Design a protein around this ligand. Structure first.
Ligand SMILES: [Zn+2]
Length: 271
């Protein structure tokens, strides 16, 4: 695998970087008991990730960031997808793309954050918030913490805040908190709030003169907005915004599942 593609030196170096990062985070927690450091890249990664996910938003040394950034940049740029190589599915300005949002070269990706705004603090959890934070680096959690400290309160639903993307190929991450759905059918208030997430993100991207923005599937997963309904709100809000403002923004709907992928194509077909 690695030999023909010349990957072996980088694998051995990335493993050494993970062990350094793991050791530093364990020392900080006063986990002084000597753990069995796994041999594999995969098992090292899941150990590192769990430790990063749970770490409170406390200062980090420049030495730690040097190692973390070398490792994260190498991993995120290995199989990068550039927006310039994709083609619009609608007009010249709307794309649908199945893939990992943390590997897309684009001005901004949109994070489905929570109101505490530090990322996902559940070890090794499969949500978008966790994945974005983990691949981007600890600097995102620290920047988020500073945003919350300066505003004196948790983040409300339907807003947008921008941070740098750090180790991601994305220049920026736009963080929005989507509505939590408990009861069905979805209230008009909650439908309006999900729309507001998209609008807020679009407005902020145009406010900063960005050329492109990729959305994930906001309020799906644990917030558990019904899928078909969310897709419909996403598409309708985007197309309305682009039409009414004559924005030059290019908008990517990032999906992972084939179910979502079909939902998005169907929504963009129906007029
Ligand atoms: Zn999570």
């Amino acid at each position: 695998r690695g030999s023909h593609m010349a990957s072996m030196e980088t694998l051995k170096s990335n493993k050494a970087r993970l062990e350094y990062l793991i050791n530093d985070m364990r020392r900080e927690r006063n986990d002084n008991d000597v753990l069995v450091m796994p041999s594999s890249f995969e098992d090292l990664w899941e150990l590192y990730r769990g430790l990063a996910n749970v770490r409170p938003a406390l200062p980090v040394s420049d030495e730690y960031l040097a190692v973390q950034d070398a490792m994260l940049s190498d991993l995120n740029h290995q199989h990068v997808t550039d927006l310039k190589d994709l083609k619009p599915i609608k007009g010249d300005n709307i794309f649908v793309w199945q893939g990992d949002i943390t590997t897309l070269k684009i001005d901004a990706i949109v994070n489905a954050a929570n109101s505490r705004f530090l990322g996902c603090m559940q070890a090794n959890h499969d949500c978008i918030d966790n994945i974005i934070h983990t691949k981007a680096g600890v600097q995102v959690r620290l920047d988020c913490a500073e945003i919350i400290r300066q505003q004196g309160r948790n983040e409300g639903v339907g807003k947008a805040k921008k941070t740098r993307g750090y180790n991601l190929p994305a220049k920026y991450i736009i963080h929005t908190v989507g509505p939590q759905i408990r009861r069905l059918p979805v209230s008009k208030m909650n439908q309006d709030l999900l729309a507001k997430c998209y609008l807020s993100c679009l407005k902020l991207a145009d406010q900063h003169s960005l050329n492109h923005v990729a959305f994930c599937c906001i309020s799906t997963g644990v917030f558990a907005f019904p899928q078909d309904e969310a897709a419909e709100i996403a598409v309708r809000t985007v197309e309305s915004y682009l039409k009414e403002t004559n924005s030059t923004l290019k908008v990517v709907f990032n999906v992972f599942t084939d179910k979502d992928l079909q939902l998005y194509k169907e929504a963009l077909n129906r007029d």
